[PDB]
Design a protein around this motif. Structure first.
Motif, PDB file in Angstrom:
ATOM      1  N   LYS A  55      -5.703   8.720   6.077  1.00  0.00           N
ATOM      2  CA  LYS A  55      -4.773   9.717   5.570  1.00  0.00           C
ATOM      3  C   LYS A  55      -5.327  11.131   5.640  1.00  0.00           C
ATOM      4  O   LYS A  55      -4.605  12.077   5.314  1.00  0.00           O
ATOM      5  CB  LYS A  55      -4.392   9.383   4.127  1.00  0.00           C
ATOM      6  CG  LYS A  55      -3.652   8.066   3.991  1.00  0.00           C
ATOM      7  CD  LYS A  55      -3.244   7.805   2.557  1.00  0.00           C
ATOM      8  CE  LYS A  55      -4.459   7.511   1.695  1.00  0.00           C
ATOM      9  NZ  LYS A  55      -5.119   6.234   2.085  1.00  0.00           N
TER      10      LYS A  55
ATOM     11  N   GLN B  98      -3.708  47.579   0.677  1.00  0.00           N
ATOM     12  CA  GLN B  98      -3.221  47.073   1.959  1.00  0.00           C
ATOM     13  C   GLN B  98      -1.752  47.412   2.179  1.00  0.00           C
ATOM     14  O   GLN B  98      -1.375  47.886   3.257  1.00  0.00           O
ATOM     15  CB  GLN B  98      -3.426  45.566   2.072  1.00  0.00           C
ATOM     16  CG  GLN B  98      -4.831  45.143   2.403  1.00  0.00           C
ATOM     17  CD  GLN B  98      -4.917  43.654   2.634  1.00  0.00           C
ATOM     18  OE1 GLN B  98      -3.958  42.923   2.397  1.00  0.00           O
ATOM     19  NE2 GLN B  98      -6.053  43.201   3.135  1.00  0.00           N
TER      20      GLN B  98
ATOM     21  N   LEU C 184     -11.280  37.875   3.618  1.00  0.00           N
ATOM     22  CA  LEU C 184     -10.011  37.181   3.733  1.00  0.00           C
ATOM     23  C   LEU C 184      -8.897  38.085   3.216  1.00  0.00           C
ATOM     24  O   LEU C 184      -9.145  39.132   2.616  1.00  0.00           O
ATOM     25  CB  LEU C 184     -10.036  35.868   2.953  1.00  0.00           C
ATOM     26  CG  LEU C 184     -10.675  34.629   3.581  1.00  0.00           C
ATOM     27  CD1 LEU C 184     -12.187  34.738   3.641  1.00  0.00           C
ATOM     28  CD2 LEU C 184     -10.270  33.399   2.788  1.00  0.00           C
ATOM     29  N   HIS C 185      -7.653  37.680   3.466  1.00  0.00           N
ATOM     30  CA  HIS C 185      -6.483  38.481   3.106  1.00  0.00           C
ATOM     31  C   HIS C 185      -6.544  39.870   3.735  1.00  0.00           C
ATOM     32  O   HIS C 185      -5.990  40.831   3.200  1.00  0.00           O
ATOM     33  CB  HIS C 185      -6.319  38.597   1.585  1.00  0.00           C
ATOM     34  CG  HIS C 185      -6.412  37.291   0.859  1.00  0.00           C
ATOM     35  ND1 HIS C 185      -7.598  36.610   0.701  1.00  0.00           N
ATOM     36  CD2 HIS C 185      -5.468  36.552   0.232  1.00  0.00           C
ATOM     37  CE1 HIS C 185      -7.379  35.500   0.020  1.00  0.00           C
ATOM     38  NE2 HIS C 185      -6.095  35.442  -0.280  1.00  0.00           N
ATOM     39  N   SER C 186      -7.226  39.990   4.870  1.00  0.00           N
ATOM     40  CA  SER C 186      -7.410  41.279   5.524  1.00  0.00           C
ATOM     41  C   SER C 186      -7.661  41.108   7.016  1.00  0.00           C
ATOM     42  O   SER C 186      -8.108  40.054   7.466  1.00  0.00           O
ATOM     43  CB  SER C 186      -8.571  42.044   4.889  1.00  0.00           C
ATOM     44  OG  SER C 186      -9.818  41.477   5.252  1.00  0.00           O
TER      45      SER C 186
ATOM     46  N   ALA D 132     -11.110   4.222   2.093  1.00  0.00           N
ATOM     47  CA  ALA D 132     -12.086   4.631   3.099  1.00  0.00           C
ATOM     48  C   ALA D 132     -13.212   3.609   3.196  1.00  0.00           C
ATOM     49  O   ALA D 132     -13.225   2.603   2.483  1.00  0.00           O
ATOM     50  CB  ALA D 132     -12.651   6.010   2.775  1.00  0.00           C
TER      51      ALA D 132
ATOM     52  N   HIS E  25      -8.070   1.226  10.752  1.00  0.00           N
ATOM     53  CA  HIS E  25      -7.432   1.922   9.647  1.00  0.00           C
ATOM     54  C   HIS E  25      -7.072   3.333  10.074  1.00  0.00           C
ATOM     55  O   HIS E  25      -7.954   4.117  10.427  1.00  0.00           O
ATOM     56  CB  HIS E  25      -8.361   1.959   8.430  1.00  0.00           C
ATOM     57  CG  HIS E  25      -7.799   2.694   7.258  1.00  0.00           C
ATOM     58  ND1 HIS E  25      -6.636   2.312   6.627  1.00  0.00           N
ATOM     59  CD2 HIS E  25      -8.242   3.790   6.598  1.00  0.00           C
ATOM     60  CE1 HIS E  25      -6.386   3.141   5.630  1.00  0.00           C
ATOM     61  NE2 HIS E  25      -7.346   4.046   5.591  1.00  0.00           N
TER      62      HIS E  25
ATOM     63  N   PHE F  53      -6.540  45.818  -4.500  1.00  0.00           N
ATOM     64  CA  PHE F  53      -6.810  45.617  -3.080  1.00  0.00           C
ATOM     65  C   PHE F  53      -5.524  45.344  -2.311  1.00  0.00           C
ATOM     66  O   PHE F  53      -5.292  45.909  -1.230  1.00  0.00           O
ATOM     67  CB  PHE F  53      -7.797  44.469  -2.893  1.00  0.00           C
ATOM     68  CG  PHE F  53      -8.045  44.119  -1.460  1.00  0.00           C
ATOM     69  CD1 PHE F  53      -8.871  44.904  -0.678  1.00  0.00           C
ATOM     70  CD2 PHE F  53      -7.461  43.002  -0.898  1.00  0.00           C
ATOM     71  CE1 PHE F  53      -9.104  44.583   0.638  1.00  0.00           C
ATOM     72  CE2 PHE F  53      -7.693  42.674   0.416  1.00  0.00           C
ATOM     73  CZ  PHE F  53      -8.516  43.467   1.185  1.00  0.00           C
TER      74      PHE F  53
ATOM     75  N   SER G  29     -12.453  29.242  -5.100  1.00  0.00           N
ATOM     76  CA  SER G  29     -12.086  30.473  -5.791  1.00  0.00           C
ATOM     77  C   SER G  29     -13.211  30.960  -6.696  1.00  0.00           C
ATOM     78  O   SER G  29     -13.007  31.257  -7.869  1.00  0.00           O
ATOM     79  CB  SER G  29     -10.805  30.258  -6.583  1.00  0.00           C
ATOM     80  OG  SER G  29     -10.451  31.429  -7.293  1.00  0.00           O
TER      81      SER G  29
ATOM     82  N   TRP H 149     -13.717  37.400  -0.757  1.00  0.00           N
ATOM     83  CA  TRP H 149     -12.283  37.200  -0.900  1.00  0.00           C
ATOM     84  C   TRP H 149     -11.497  38.257  -0.141  1.00  0.00           C
ATOM     85  O   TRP H 149     -10.460  37.953   0.453  1.00  0.00           O
ATOM     86  CB  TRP H 149     -11.892  37.212  -2.374  1.00  0.00           C
ATOM     87  CG  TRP H 149     -10.419  37.132  -2.596  1.00  0.00           C
ATOM     88  CD1 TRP H 149      -9.668  36.004  -2.697  1.00  0.00           C
ATOM     89  CD2 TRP H 149      -9.515  38.230  -2.750  1.00  0.00           C
ATOM     90  NE1 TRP H 149      -8.352  36.327  -2.906  1.00  0.00           N
ATOM     91  CE2 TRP H 149      -8.232  37.690  -2.943  1.00  0.00           C
ATOM     92  CE3 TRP H 149      -9.667  39.618  -2.745  1.00  0.00           C
ATOM     93  CZ2 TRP H 149      -7.109  38.487  -3.128  1.00  0.00           C
ATOM     94  CZ3 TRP H 149      -8.553  40.405  -2.928  1.00  0.00           C
ATOM     95  CH2 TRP H 149      -7.291  39.839  -3.117  1.00  0.00           C
ATOM     96  N   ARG H 150     -11.964  39.501  -0.159  1.00  0.00           N
ATOM     97  CA  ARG H 150     -11.235  40.571   0.501  1.00  0.00           C
ATOM     98  C   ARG H 150     -11.563  40.701   1.983  1.00  0.00           C
ATOM     99  O   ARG H 150     -10.879  41.455   2.681  1.00  0.00           O
ATOM    100  CB  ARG H 150     -11.473  41.914  -0.197  1.00  0.00           C
ATOM    101  CG  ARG H 150     -12.894  42.405  -0.194  1.00  0.00           C
ATOM    102  CD  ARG H 150     -12.951  43.851  -0.664  1.00  0.00           C
ATOM    103  NE  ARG H 150     -12.440  44.032  -2.017  1.00  0.00           N
ATOM    104  CZ  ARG H 150     -13.182  43.973  -3.112  1.00  0.00           C
ATOM    105  NH1 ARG H 150     -14.480  43.731  -3.055  1.00  0.00           N
ATOM    106  NH2 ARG H 150     -12.608  44.167  -4.296  1.00  0.00           N
TER     107      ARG H 150
ATOM    108  N   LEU I 277     -16.177  38.926  -4.772  1.00  0.00           N
ATOM    109  CA  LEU I 277     -14.846  39.314  -4.322  1.00  0.00           C
ATOM    110  C   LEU I 277     -14.857  39.928  -2.933  1.00  0.00           C
ATOM    111  O   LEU I 277     -13.792  40.070  -2.327  1.00  0.00           O
ATOM    112  CB  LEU I 277     -14.203  40.295  -5.299  1.00  0.00           C
ATOM    113  CG  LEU I 277     -13.356  39.685  -6.409  1.00  0.00           C
ATOM    114  CD1 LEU I 277     -12.892  40.762  -7.361  1.00  0.00           C
ATOM    115  CD2 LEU I 277     -12.171  38.964  -5.809  1.00  0.00           C
TER     116      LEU I 277
ATOM    117  N   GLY J  95     -16.830  -1.755   4.078  1.00  0.00           N
ATOM    118  CA  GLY J  95     -16.086  -0.536   3.884  1.00  0.00           C
ATOM    119  C   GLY J  95     -16.609   0.662   4.638  1.00  0.00           C
ATOM    120  O   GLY J  95     -15.924   1.688   4.684  1.00  0.00           O
TER     121      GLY J  95
END
Ligand SMILES: [Mg+2]
Ligand SMILES: [Mg+2]
Ligand SMILES: [Mg+2]
Ligand SMILES: [Mg+2]
Ligand SMILES: [Mg+2]
Ligand SMILES: [Mg+2]
Ligand SMILES: [Mg+2]
Ligand SMILES: [Mg+2]
Ligand SMILES: [Mg+2]
Ligand SMILES: [Mg+2]
Lengths: 213, 170, 159, 293
Positions: free
Chosen positions: A168, D290, A211-213, C159, A165, D286, A201, A208-209, A205, A131
């Motif tokens: 996927k 924006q 990102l989204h910016s 796999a 193989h 936030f 997640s 996180w901010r 933060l 395998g």
RNA sequence: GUCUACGGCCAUACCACCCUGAACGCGCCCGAUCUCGUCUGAUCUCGGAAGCUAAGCAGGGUCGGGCCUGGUUAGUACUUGGAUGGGAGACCGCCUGGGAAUACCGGGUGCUGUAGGCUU
RNA sequence: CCUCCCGUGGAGCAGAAGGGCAAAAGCUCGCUUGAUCUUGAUUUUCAGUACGAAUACAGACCGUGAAAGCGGGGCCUCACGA
RNA sequence: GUUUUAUCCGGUAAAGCGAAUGAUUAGAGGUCUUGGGGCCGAAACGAUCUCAACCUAUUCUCAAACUUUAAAUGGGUAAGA
């Protein structure tokens, strides 16, 4: 100069890595493990095809080198030099030994037979399980048949039985191809080079901010 | 508006004279430091042996002494008078304390003596606030906390307000 | 062809657990060991004095002698086809009370109290603990819910 | 930066914290193990130690024995209860250390009912004294000094407290090398300057020394001594009558206070719902910032 | 509701940064005659009480790191005992019992003993 | 060389390696000779013989420390002889 | 030469290496330096392009003399006059 691979085909010993106890190991035959357009981004090469062993055995570094060369030549012939990326997923970490005998017409000449029979490092092999993946090729989705033929041709350089193989997962990532696009859209994945970074997640933060910016 | 317990002040001054070798030169340098500070200095052995500098391990190389309080204030005043109250931007460390060097020990107060050389020396003043001693106390020692620390900018500002100095763009 | 050193093969046996190095906690010293009580010999490696031999690590014995810092333990050791009761001096860092004895004595005290109470109130009560009996007859309600039908899933290479 | 982060994830993953009181810098466990652990062939015979802790404004003298669930304290004396009789100012000095050690000694002996026997050294001098158990009578109480992290050089207030206790009547093994009277040069104990320290004569000499040089510096130093008029000539008699009062009544009575409404002065820990709501609001604000751009 | 002294378990307690702290306390703080130590009263020792919660400390915060504990991984990997089971072998399946560990996804962030204070 | 900050040990502990250890067992000072005089018991190899080595005690005489205590060689696993 | 019920002992199989110690593949993002240098920059590389080294978050593959975690089988003790 080298024994037939049938003498070292099976995993008969405990792993014998090159360490501070096993000294004087010659270099492995395979030094390069990634070929093709390694710098290609993740979305560039969506299709990933693996070649998977079916036998618990030992693959020599020379065999890995030969299979890598064969697959590289066929992929360059079919898809061009920038149309694929290959990764060998086996590293020859297990040192195989040889108890060398004098190949002359004499046993009196200090042969000693089986006395002090522990051998000097002959070479290096890789241990593969049932395998486990030996080679991977990622490329465009329309080169599936070319990938399959390249892996089929590379199979002939190895002792045991191998399967082809079409995975996927998206490329060399560990995420499913069908779930890759929406995950990148919702920014659970961020591309970097040939792979992606999973963004959970949790954490500050501020990450996180950015990102989204 | 400003808490009186946050005022910067000199903790120690840490004079150091690194004579290359031991012997009469080091003894005269120790006499220089004792004359300047009114305070007996101590010698420093060499940690290792280096042929290039020609010193052996455990050989008395340098002399040094730490000075605290009003005497530190006066000695720093004399050293900065020699330095013309100007220091380079990089003379300040990131931990909030700074230092400089004096090429000749006789241009700050101390008169020359024939049985005394022309030794130079290093000044390295360590700034501090009330409450820095908790990092050194024995029982219930602790760190000082982030806001209580001294930055390079704060050390430069304190130098500018106290000794009306000039921070050259070195 | 093996060496006979006292601590051969004790590399992990006498090593400390992960992130439990350093100062020995003082309750281990604050324990009380009377003669006749049952202790487990473990043998931590922080304290090199009074250590037990590796054949007594994990064994359990009975205390027969108490000194300032150690105890004398009678512990069974099997040598070939005979078991002999060895007497070993072990510092108290390497021992602790065996909870099997504590549970047994608590059970004995509880059974004696049960006998006293049952002789007070007349009715007999069971004291010998019985092995796990076979399960008794019972009804299993469906609650108006048909049980879910399960079938084996088709094979696929992953796999 | 360009240097390896020393305190990365793996550093904290393998980090082993020390004991809580070791991290707080309060307990020397190396000394504690030798100090509180009883011999195993003594079984549950308690091992008593006299903890002495000198504080910035107080002296704590306690007698305790170790147990698995924690130290068990049988008697405690403080320098802040000295103003109950006699000395009211200039606590946390050597004379107050002697007084609080004597108070602990007398209070423990009164609780155990050994007062008429083991009277101790009532007539105070700085010379050595060691109470001897009377046959046919309950034995003298024996405890060992716990100085903690204090530096036990000559003249320490922990040894002042020890002298107070051994004059009160406890059998504490000690020597005179660490009393203030000891001469480190001739290796001799003066036993009179020690009594001067016990009676606070050094502080009185400091007061009358400051008076003759710098009166305002004297005020700044002994400001609270001026209040209620404690003077160098009466300091020794103050301490003598304080010792007499300690011998006269060592019993402690507690001060009652129960008419207090249950008011909370600390912020309670936020709930999971509150933290999640705070995160959601921060995200929404936030995104609002924006879209306002 | 908290603190002090001495602790037990020794991160649910640690680490980084931010906010708050009433009263006692704990501290920072002031000084060097005495006790005692220094190159230096910085540390240590001693004598204090002008100021301050700035720091230590305490509580709280962080889609925080760690740690603790669950879910998943997974009845997977591995495994006791069985067969004149399969396969040229390498190895694999089944019967009979036991049964994990990452990644990933949640929750939590000291409990408590003795003695003594503060809190209308 | 001097100063500050971080620093769970990533150094050191005579030597091989392994274990152990942070106001330690490491480094530096001060005082010292418990590396001393004795009888038994025990552990290790083991036949449960010896040697060697070790562990816990007991009785002296001491050392150190304010003291609790610790010390009859070396932090432990070798360094030896009818 | 057994199970059961309590209770300890262990570091093998497996697993892990975005956890320590060793081994090891590839890209990605940053900005200091005796990296090379760089094409028009000597002139303040006026500039900022590349490749190094370094750091950070990832990524492929490993260990009889590595390990956080960790079985099955196993070893000890107890289950009273
Ligand atoms: Mg042939
Ligand atoms: Mg073999
Ligand atoms: Mg001590
Ligand atoms: Mg977290
Ligand atoms: Mg099975
Ligand atoms: Mg003796
Ligand atoms: Mg020893
Ligand atoms: Mg093993
Ligand atoms: Mg394995
Ligand atoms: Mg690794």
């Amino acid at each position: 100069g080298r024994r037939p691979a049938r003498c070292y085909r099976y995993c008969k010993n405990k792993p014998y890595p090159k360490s501070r106890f096993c000294r004087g190991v010659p270099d492995a035959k395979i030094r390069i493990f990634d070929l093709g357009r390694k710098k290609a981004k993740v979305d560039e090469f969506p299709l990933g095809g693996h070649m998977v062993s079916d036998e618990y055995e030992q693959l020599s570094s020379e065999a890995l080198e030969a299979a890598r060369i064969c697959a590289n030549k066929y992929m360059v012939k079919s898809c061009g030099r920038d149309g694929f990326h290959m990764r060998v997923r086996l590293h020859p970490f297990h040192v195989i030994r040889i108890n060398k005998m004098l190949s002359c017409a004499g046993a009196d000449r200090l042969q000693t037979g089986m006395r002090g029979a522990f051998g000097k490092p002959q070479g290096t092999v890789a241990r593969v399980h049932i395998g486990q993946v030996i080679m991977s090729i990622r490329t465009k989705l329309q080169n599936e048949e070319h990938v399959i033929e390249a892996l089929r041709r590379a199979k002939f350089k190895f002792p045991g039985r191998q399967k082809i193989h079409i995975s996927k997962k998206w490329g060399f990532t560990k995420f499913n191809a069908d779930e890759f696009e929406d995950m990148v859209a919702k920014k659970c994945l961020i591309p970097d080079g040939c792979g992606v970074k999973y963004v959970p997640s949790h954490g500050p933060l501020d990450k996180w901010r950015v990102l989204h910016s | 508006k400003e808490n009186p317990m946050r005022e910067l002040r000199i903790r120690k001054l840490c004079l150091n004279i690194c004579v290359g070798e031991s012997g009469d030169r080091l003894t005269r340098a120790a006499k220089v430091l004792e004359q300047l500070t009114g305070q007996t200095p101590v010698f420093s052995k060499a940690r290792y042996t280096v042929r290039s500098f020609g010193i052996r391990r455990n050989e008395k190389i340098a002399v040094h002494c730490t000075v605290r309080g009003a005497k530190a204030e006066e000695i720093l005043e004399k050293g900065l008078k020699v330095r013309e109250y100007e220091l380079r931007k990089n003379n300040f460390s990131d931990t909030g304390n700074f230092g400089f060097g004096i090429q000749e020990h006789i241009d700050l107060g101390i008169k020359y003596d024939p049985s005394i050389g022309i030794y130079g020396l290093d000044f390295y003043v360590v700034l501090g606030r009330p409450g820095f001693s908790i990092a050194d106390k024995k029982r219930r020692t602790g760190c000082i906390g982030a806001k209580h620390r001294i930055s390079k900018e704060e050390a430069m500002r304190w130098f500018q307000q106290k000794y009306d100095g000039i921070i050259l763009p070195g | 062809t093996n060496t006979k050193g006292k601590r051969r093969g004790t590399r992990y046996m006498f090593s400390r657990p992960f992130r439990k190095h350093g100062v020995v906690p003082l309750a281990t010293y604050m324990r009380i060991y009377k003669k006749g009580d049952i202790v487990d010999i473990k043998g931590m490696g922080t304290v090199q004095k009074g250590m037990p031999h590796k054949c007594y690590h994990g064994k359990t014995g009975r205390v027969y002698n108490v000194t300032q810092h150690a105890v004398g333990i009678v512990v069974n050791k099997q040598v070939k086809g005979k078991i002999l009761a060895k007497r070993i001096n072990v510092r108290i860092e390497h021992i602790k009370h065996s909870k099997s004895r504590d549970s047994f004595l608590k059970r004995v005290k509880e059974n004696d109290q049960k006998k006293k109470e049952a002789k007070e109130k007349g009715t007999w009560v069971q004291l010998k603990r019985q092995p796990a009996p076979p399960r008794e007859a019972h009804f299993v309600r469906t609650n108006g819910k048909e049980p879910e039908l399960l079938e084996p899933i088709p094979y696929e290479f992953m796999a | 930066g360009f240097v390896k982060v020393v305190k990365n994830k793996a550093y904290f993953k393998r980090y082993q914290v020390k004991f809580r009181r070791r991290r707080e810098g309060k307990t020397d466990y190396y000394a504690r193990k030798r100090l509180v652990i009883q011999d195993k062939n003594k079984y549950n015979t308690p091992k008593y130690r006299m903890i002495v802790r000198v504080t910035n404004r107080d002296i704590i003298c306690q007698i305790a024995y170790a147990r698995i669930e924690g130290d068990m304290i049988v008697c405690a004396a403080y320098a802040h209860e000295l103003p109950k009789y006699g000395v009211k100012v200039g606590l946390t000095n050597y004379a107050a250390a002697y007084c609080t050690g004597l108070l602990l000694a007398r209070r423990l002996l009164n609780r155990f009912g050994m007062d008429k026997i083991y009277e101790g050294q009532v007539e105070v001098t700085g010379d050595e004294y060691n109470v001897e158990s009377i046959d046919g009578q309950p034995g003298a109480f024996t405890c060992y000094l716990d100085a903690g992290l204090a530096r036990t050089t000559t003249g320490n207030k922990v040894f002042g407290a020890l002298k107070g206790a051994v004059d009160g009547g406890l059998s504490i093994p000690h020597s005179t090398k660490r009393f203030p009277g000891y001469d480190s040069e001739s290796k001799e104990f003066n036993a009179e300057v020690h009594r001067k320290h016990i009676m606070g004569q050094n502080v009185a000499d400091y007061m009358r020394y400051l008076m003759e040089e710098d009166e305002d510096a004297y005020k700044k130093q002994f400001s609270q001594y001026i209040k209620n008029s404690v003077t160098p000539d009466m300091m020794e008699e103050m301490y003598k009558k304080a010792h007499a009062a300690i011998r006269e009544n060592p019993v402690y009575e507690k001060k009652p206070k129960k008419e207090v409404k249950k008011k909370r002065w600390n912020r309670p820990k936020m709930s999971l719902a509150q933290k999640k709501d705070r995160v959601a609001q921060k995200k929404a604000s936030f995104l609002r910032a924006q879209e306002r751009a």
